[PDB]
Symmetry: D2
Subunit: 109 residues, 4 copies
């Protein structure tokens, strides 16, 4: 669903979705935003390797990694340690937000 | 749905939802998080007035306002001008994040 | 999410949701539709037993069963064998539909 | 969202969605199911006309109509008058179900 939280990854073929928009870590290692069947943005790393994963890290940087765990693309927003979210929004932008400023503190474990 | 963006409000009776969790600006001016029919957190401003609205502001502060536009509760996170989101998360926390650090820039208007 | 398919069950504490509406198989064996924290319909079998499950069956009947697998409530719509769905709808009704009349035939396994 | 109810239509460019699946009434009058950017089924009426609509009717038939209101494709499931749903399911099938067999009767107006 529409959010990737810091600490989580998208494995090969996993995605975020919002309405007709899909943001997917393809198995060809390209990361693409589709509007239905039209690609509207990508990391342009298709063919660079196979079975990459996407990580939303707690330093705030969003990074595509190869199966050997070498970076192949990153947003370059690596900064203070904290909690972040990457959001596929209702207006079609994909946006990284953080750190957390306030919380009810009602989470469960 | 699970996000209130900076610049938007919840009017009386409007809500965020995620699974069995509901975060609603009640018409008695109380703002409450329910887990099904159990209230798990609230602003405890019920009865203070009627037909309040909730605003997620671009200074980053989340504020309950009376029909005359006087604040009656706030998160006290008012700070730099920017884009924020308030999120009802899958783990039951409600969290404010911002400002925006990175975007694909694919939004529409 | 808002549909229970024939062949599936809700275990104790599992639910359907649509916006502020929740339809849950409670662990007290009562099956209840909530509008936020207000109960608007129930099977009224609370206390009859503990850790019941809900089954949407392929004969079309929706049935609450006790841990020993004895029926304690049913919709009485048991009829022809086929595919059905129970839907929590956007207008707040909960409705059983079937059998299947037409399909693209694009399902995966 | 994933259901078209009897009595409703999809106008040009409107769609159903479920995860990475999208079922859209295109403005070229073709009705297509996409798995991300791959078309997996269609009515193959692209180019036949422009700005068609999709109707889920109360006789149970799902019909593509031209701007002049002449049928150009139909599921051929027109039958008894009642309530139906067309569902884009989690397993990638698109399925018509009806009529309604049972309801809580809690809808609002
Ligand atoms: O092919 C060029 C391509 O550049 C753009 O997107 C950028 C690339 O995907 C990659 O370099 O990562 C960038 C990081 O933040 C990303 O924006 C777009 O400007 C696109 O319009 C253009 O086609
Ligand atoms: O097999 C090629 C590939 O096509 C589509 O992915 C595309 C490629 O990653 C590359 O061409 O970049 C395109 C965006 O700029 C992207 O659409 C998908 O159909 C993919 O699944 C397939 O592997
Ligand atoms: O904080 C260091 C960080 O290192 C790895 O991450 C890197 C940083 O995010 C930044 O330097 O950009 C690199 C890619 O361009 C990226 O790999 C991991 O070791 C991470 O877990 C660690 O926190
Ligand atoms: O406060 C925001 C934050 O709360 C929850 O995360 C917690 C914090 O990272 C810190 O308290 O450490 C906790 C673990 O021991 C962790 O729960 C989450 O809901 C997170 O998503 C949120 O941003
Ligand atoms: O009734 C006391 C109540 O306090 C708490 O929540 C706080 C209040 O809702 C209000 O003061 O706003 C606070 C702001 O950030 C909010 O947390 C909780 O601690 C609750 O456990 C307690 O019942
Ligand atoms: O009519 C009272 C009120 O009850 C419920 O709201 C409650 C009140 O706002 C106050 O008691 O605080 C409770 C949480 O601490 C909250 O549940 C709702 O049923 C509401 O709709 C109703 O108006
Ligand atoms: O930036 C000033 C701000 O004022 C109003 O907002 C206030 C601030 O967020 C902060 O002071 O907290 C007040 C409540 O406790 C809150 O009203 C509005 O005028 C707003 O639009 C403006 O940006
Ligand atoms: O960059 C993040 C931001 O992008 C989009 O908002 C834009 C900015 O606020 C700035 O560019 O001004 C624009 C308007 O003239 C506005 O679109 C949104 O998608 C926003 O949600 C996002 O945080
Ligand atoms: O308490 C009486 C209750 O009856 C009603 O709902 C019915 C019961 O939940 C149970 O008998 O199962 C019925 C099956 O199809 C169900 O409707 C409602 O009429 C309710 O209004 C009334 O309170
Ligand atoms: O502990 C009692 C019970 O209260 C609520 O469930 C209620 C009961 O099942 C019975 O009273 O019927 C009510 C509807 O007619 C129903 O709300 C829940 O809070 C439940 O979790 C709790 O176990
Ligand atoms: O078709 C028989 C059916 O039997 C059980 O189900 C029952 C029927 O749905 C109907 O008789 O109502 C009963 C409750 O009031 C219900 O148990 C199971 O054996 C089922 O799997 C089987 O198909
Ligand atoms: O045709 C509607 C039906 O299709 C899919 O179910 C299939 C049928 O029950 C029949 O073909 O047997 C198949 C298994 O061997 C089964 O897949 C599902 O998508 C179902 O939900 C749907 O109603
Ligand atoms: O191009 C032939 C095409 O036929 C199929 O789907 C059918 C057509 O879209 C149209 O005739 O409407 C049919 C109605 O119920 C629909 O299935 C598929 O069999 C497809 O595999 C094939 O490519
Ligand atoms: O402009 C052509 C058209 O391409 C895509 O729609 C396709 C056509 O309707 C026709 O070729 O059938 C295809 C499926 O069999 C279908 O994908 C879309 O990109 C559409 O928006 C565009 O108008
Ligand atoms: O019940 C008649 C019906 O007529 C129109 O619908 C038609 C039927 O569903 C069936 O004959 O198939 C036709 C297309 O192949 C379809 O148009 C409308 O007049 C409808 O509203 C009416 O109920
Ligand atoms: O019973 C299932 C049905 O209930 C609701 O629809 C109603 C019926 O069509 C009949 O009662 O006429 C009513 C209008 O005067 C109408 O509400 C809906 O929730 C429908 O979706 C559902 O299938």
């Amino acid at each position: 669903d529409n959010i990737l939280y810091s600490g989580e990854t998208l494995s090969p073929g996993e995605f975020l979705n919002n309405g007709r928009y899909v943001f997917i870590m393809q198995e060809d290692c390209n990361l693409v935003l589709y509007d239905v069947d039209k690609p509207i943005w990508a990391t342009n790393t298709g063919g660079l390797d196979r079975r990459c994963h996407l990580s939303m890290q707690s330093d705030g940087n969003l990074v595509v990694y190869s199966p050997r765990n070498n970076p192949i693309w990153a947003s370059n927003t690596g900064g203070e340690n904290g909690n972040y979210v990457c959001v596929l929004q209702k207006d079609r932008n994909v946006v990284i937000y953080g750190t957390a400023r306030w919380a009810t503190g009602t989470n469960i474990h």
